[PDB]
Design a protein around this ligand. Sequence first.
Ligand SMILES: [Zn+2]
Ligand SMILES: [Zn+2]
Ligand SMILES: [Zn+2]
Ligand SMILES: [Zn+2]
Ligand SMILES: [Zn+2]
Ligand SMILES: [Zn+2]
Lengths: 590, 590, 186, 396
Amino acid sequence: AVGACVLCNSQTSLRCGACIRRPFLCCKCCYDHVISTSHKLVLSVNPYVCNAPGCDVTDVTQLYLGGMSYYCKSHKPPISFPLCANGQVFGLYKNTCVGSDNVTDFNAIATCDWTNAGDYILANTCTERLKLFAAETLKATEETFKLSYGIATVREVLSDRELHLSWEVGKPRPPLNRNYVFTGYRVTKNSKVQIGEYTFEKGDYGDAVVYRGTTTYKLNVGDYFVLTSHTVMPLSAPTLVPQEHYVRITGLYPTLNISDEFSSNVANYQKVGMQKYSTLQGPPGTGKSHFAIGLALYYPSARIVYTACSHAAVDALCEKALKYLPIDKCSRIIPARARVECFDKFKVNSTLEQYVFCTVNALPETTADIVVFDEISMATNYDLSVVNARLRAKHYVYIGDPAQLPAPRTLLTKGTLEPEYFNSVCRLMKTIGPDMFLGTCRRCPAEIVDTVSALVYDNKLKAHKDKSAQCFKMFYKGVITHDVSSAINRPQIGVVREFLTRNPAWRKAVFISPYNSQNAVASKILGLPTQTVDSSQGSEYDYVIFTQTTETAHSCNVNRFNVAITRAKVGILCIMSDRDLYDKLQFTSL
Amino acid sequence: AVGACVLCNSQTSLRCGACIRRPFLCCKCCYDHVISTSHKLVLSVNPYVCNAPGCDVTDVTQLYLGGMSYYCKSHKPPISFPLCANGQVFGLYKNTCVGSDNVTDFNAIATCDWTNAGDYILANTCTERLKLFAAETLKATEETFKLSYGIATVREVLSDRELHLSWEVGKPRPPLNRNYVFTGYRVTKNSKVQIGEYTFEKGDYGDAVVYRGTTTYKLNVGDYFVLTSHTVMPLSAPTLVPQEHYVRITGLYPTLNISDEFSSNVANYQKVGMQKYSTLQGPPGTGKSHFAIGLALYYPSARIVYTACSHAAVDALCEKALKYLPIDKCSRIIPARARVECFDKFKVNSTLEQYVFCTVNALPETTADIVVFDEISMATNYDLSVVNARLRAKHYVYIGDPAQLPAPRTLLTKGTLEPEYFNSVCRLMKTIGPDMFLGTCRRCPAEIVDTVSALVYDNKLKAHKDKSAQCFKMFYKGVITHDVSSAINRPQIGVVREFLTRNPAWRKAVFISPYNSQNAVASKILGLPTQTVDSSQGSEYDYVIFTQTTETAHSCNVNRFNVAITRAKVGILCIMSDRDLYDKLQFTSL
Amino acid sequence: FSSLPSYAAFATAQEAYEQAVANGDSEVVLKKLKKSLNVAKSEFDRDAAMQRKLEKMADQAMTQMYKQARSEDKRAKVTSAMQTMLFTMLRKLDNDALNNIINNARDGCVPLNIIPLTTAAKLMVVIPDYNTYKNTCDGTTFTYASALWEIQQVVDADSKIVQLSEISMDNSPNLAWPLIVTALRA
Amino acid sequence: NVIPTITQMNLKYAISAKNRARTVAGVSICSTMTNRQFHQKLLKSIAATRGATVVIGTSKFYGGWHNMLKTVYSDVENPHLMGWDYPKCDRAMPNMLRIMASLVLARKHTTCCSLSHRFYRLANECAQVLSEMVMCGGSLYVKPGGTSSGDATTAYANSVFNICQAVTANVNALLSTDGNKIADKYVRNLQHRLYECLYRNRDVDTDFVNEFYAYLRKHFSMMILSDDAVVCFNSTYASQGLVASIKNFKSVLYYQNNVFMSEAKCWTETDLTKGPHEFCSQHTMLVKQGDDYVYLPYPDPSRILGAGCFVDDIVKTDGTLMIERFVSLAIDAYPLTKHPNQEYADVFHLYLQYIRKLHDELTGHMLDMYSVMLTNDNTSRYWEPEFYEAMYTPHT
RNA sequence: GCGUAGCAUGCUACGUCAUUCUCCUAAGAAGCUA
RNA sequence: UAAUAGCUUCUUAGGAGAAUGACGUAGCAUGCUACGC
Ligand SMILES: [Zn+2]
Ligand SMILES: [Zn+2]
Ligand SMILES: [Zn+2]
Ligand SMILES: [Zn+2]
Ligand SMILES: [Zn+2]
Ligand SMILES: [Zn+2]
């Protein structure tokens, strides 16, 4: 199967068998790669090996072709010649293979293991074709790394709403949330097969799990759980189509009597209909989700495709649209596997509908008028290319805040990925600035809102409110136990329950923690409704209690702190450790 | 890969490389062509370059056929024989060729650059195959002329409605109008690719152009424009099928009581059916465009193909058909790019419909029962061959008035082209006379129609109205200002503005002038709608203010002045510069 | 060929031989250079001949490697076409009636010849003449396979629509037999 | 496993003498591949063997026809040549005989396959060839049976069937005789043991089978090409009823093909010097070649003239583009020169003169489209009878 | 007589090339038969 | 839309083999001559 060279697009049929992706390479580029890097295994229509009766030589420069086969120096016939000579590698279209000096970065892209931060940043500044390859190989590295995971099974039948966990000894465990699902396997005697996938959350005490059931087929101990690895398919479309602005709105016909609710964004809406792709950013809780429905109502007779990486965001957008937009002309696209508790309120899974909601993974190849991508911060370049490929629309609308949290990026373990290099869209937004912004806020007290605006943003937020005087920030040690995959602070909750008797206000509060272990545990001794930091970002509250467990870079992340403290409205009791964080914000000392 | 010699139609395989079209020539005719003209490159199945290891000799008389191939004087084996010898040039079918001295004219056709007026008249009075070849050559010359056209670009955009233009320094600036269209470039790093089809027309104040785009793509400052170009396929069909006179109607079937409007038009349709093809000539707006629809109603079952070379006239024709012809059995074919916004009311782009309307360039290859081509004046012989080829019909009907403005013929810059040489159909119309004629005017007052009945028409037109005494001829010196390469007559503008506040019943009259510069610059000062003479054709207005910009062959064109004056309805004021023009008309005194 | 230094060695040996000959070199010297010229020429042809094998050998590799590349490129296209055909044919199945009949099977296996006869939603009857028409499917509805069908279309050999009233004994010669009549299950 | 298969019906666009449409079966590649891989060793073994009863792969040129006919005359006593015809051979074939032919062809897999493998191969053969789904104009019908003319083993299976019918005719003829009228004691004993081994014995008596096979080869020598049979039977025995005659073939066809075989389509020749009256649509004649007499096959002149006049595609009409066509036709028609009837002989001279005229006209057109005549022109040998005479000499 | 060197003639081996022929394969065009 | 198998004719490309011819290197056999013993 012939293809195109990655760094010169020239016709070729050569692949670097040593590279994980075996990308296509032309004669000149392939020679530059093999001579430069340590990769000395290259795949043409046939593998390049010594085809002797008994011999094993994989190096290409040491291989010579004889008869109709390939051999080393010790098995060649009296006739020549080297495969790797004349500055070129022997192959197809030998006389149209143009070389490029870009091999210098290609070597780093291929040879790196993504452990350090430098790879990501350099994996994002490369050209389009190299960008796609870097994304593909990074995702392949992620999947391969996931192949090394801790497998478990149910101890036995304990409760219908909660199972128990029995992991293998000598392997780690993954984080427990909605993003991470697991597959049960049925190797009993008797035909290893699947019955359903489960999502797990830490149990009450010791060992236990409060789970989510996908299929009603209940399992005995004959099955065991794995972290549902899979493969990666290749990509062709660019991360971002070229920016081509418009003069007057084309294909998008404005509405009549749009609404009195969001008439302030009309200009933005037409500007949303202006650029081929538009980038809007708004701080936590400012109606960008609201802006999406506003835009949809601005163009009523246009087919709109809502897209988001995760189920939570797309489901929230779906609910908001049901609330405002007409409910009949809706089509939520559901994965066939249904590994999540899906959203079934519309006439579900009608791909030929006007307002079509889908997640990045389950998008079917179709066409639209305008597509709105949401939460690009967690989105990766792979997602961007996938949406570019499967979907074609007259307009694109990327809405998200790089000041939010990043994608998981589990393989990254050393170095901190700064916002500018989260992905192509984040780099664009940090380079030229978002095409749109709305800086009004209505939730946080005066001192907190002013200080938060002062931390990272350019002093453009103010609260149409007066401080409720129930916001605090203390210095409690909260000795750490952390005897589980995530940190826990129980004695901090003890210090809190020393309070909460003199402050009857927040007796219906929501507990939040930067570690899901404390999130699980805090709901056990006391029945406080729980909502991890990730599960925030889309809802507003008046009584929230956030607790800090450790002191590190993950604890001083201004993005995490911002999204943590901006969710309360009138009262929040805080457990805080670091003086550095303590000197940026004003709170009562108690 | 053989063919026929153009001017003797003998079997041949030799083509003149120096000829743009590389036409087929026989040995004798090729010999005569090369020996006399600068053309000294001939293409057989193999090129006649000297096939030495290194040598470049293209002149035919300099070469020999030696060994197996063609070689020069000092590169031939000892066994040589001259190619261009014995009154011939070696080629296939050598001893079965015959030619005549008429090559003399063909020599002129090959050599002429299509700059002088004699070129066209000679090109339109040659033999039929010579006629086809001349049209091919003129079209090729026009296409090749675009290669030297200048490159524009955008300075900035203060208003999205009007672009700010910048021509490349050191190259001619093409005029701004509808006939010329541009496609863009984004050559920066980063997308040396097209960015849509646009068009231009100058802005009145300062430097600005009110523009329009087929697509919507706005230009970054880096983005720029260049005039579009499309290759040409050689035409084969004759300009006109030979005329054959039948005894009765064959293949067409009349109607029962067609209507009360076309009752006087019956013998016309009879004559159309009797003859193979027919020509209708008459002044503008006399029932010509109405005639075709009347014929269609006269032959309902007949499949009919309306064709025009332009897009504005066919749109009005489609509007008239909608007014009369059934909406169901109608169609409208637009090119893939669809440069101009065409008539979108029928089942668009349905070639297989009974009644199909199209422009010449986007015609598909199909059959029909009758093809009606309208407004022959704007079409060239190339268009005639194209329509004769693509559309195959039992009957052919041609409508258009020679006195109307001809095709652009931009290369023409010396001499004047008479109506009888616009194309073959116009030549037939003027030579023996049209097959049919009708003359009557129903729109303008009695006075200006009486005058035009003597200007170009020989006291042919009666009218149905009463002279309102609002026909005004003004005589002022009108000092010249050659500003934009099109003359601007500022003092005549002064006279206009000074007797526009003195004429309360003329506060909306459309300002008309042959030059676009004065036409545009008048907009900012007297505020009336502005319309140039060229595009003013086909539009009627209640009141008109014409202004003879300067005395010259362009502004003093009797045809242009006629089409300018014949757009008024109840009255018109005109500014005359030349004494003869002011006197031959008979207006009020002023 | 000429690229290899053997050509240059032969050329310089030949030049030296010619210079010696024109310079009247002695016989002993003349033989030495001629012998030197021969061995130089010997090497020149020796490595020249192997080139014929080389470029010859490369061409089969290209043609072979063209062919192998050509085949696989075509293999994927046909595989995709076959998969699309299979899935498109799947979507035509009447799942309800098919499941009902196949579940009644004792072993879950049924002869193919009854799969259409008990589930096909459209019946085509090809009729050669009027007598067979009248016998088999007279009227707008008829019975076949222990089921009731209703006529929805009738066409002639030319795929031209025909009205039911036109199928009469007297009008039979005017019809382009055979007739294809398409009916639906009721 | 079993793979049922669809086979298309293709109208045969070829010259013929009777208006009835001719159809062939296009078998799916999925069946052709397996049938080839299972049968081709035996098939090539048959096609590459000389002097057997099944003459396939034996060229009729280079004196092949004479060798064939001399092998037919395998020292029979009072020779009489005879040939029969099968009306609707491929469509009246009983299913049982097709299965029998497939089993006989499969008997060679005594080591490469176990029993179940052979049975499933037979099942696939039946499901794909014998009674399969047939596509006729975009419509699937069921073929009731009978051999399709498209499978891998189409000529060889029919050859086996033909031999089966001939042997059955011999058996019925030998049994149906009175028994008391057979003077020769050996034949009476042979008939007795034949009846015993048929209706009174359940395991094969290989001794008697060999004896009967020798009997048939001694008095019923055969030539078979898949449906065309030439027999050189002893006429004395046939008159006495000890070997199959035409009437025996008629009866056998009646009760094992459900068809009637009119005697008008079967020919008997009492003189060997005239050779078989017709075989593979080739009449035979004895002519003096070199210094000895040999048999030559010549076709019906009407067929050759028809192939000369009518062609199945327009481009073949030019002629000059196709000289090899007329060369091949002349090669086929050469033996007609030796025919006593002059109008027969004139066909070959017509083809020779016509080939010469095309060569001349081709050279003229070539010299018109250019001005140099082809340096190498060996076509002069194609209008000389020696080149054709060589094709019917046993040297090669 | 022996050794070295040179020239001439002849035989064998290897290398290069020219022509002719035989076959082995592959590809293409065409015909005939069942 | 155009089946399985066989036979034959022609064209082109490739490999191998053989024959003859020519040139070059090497090995061996013989003849003549120059120097030393
Ligand atoms: Zn690599
Ligand atoms: Zn490359
Ligand atoms: Zn090896
Ligand atoms: Zn020329
Ligand atoms: Zn000529
Ligand atoms: Zn030269």
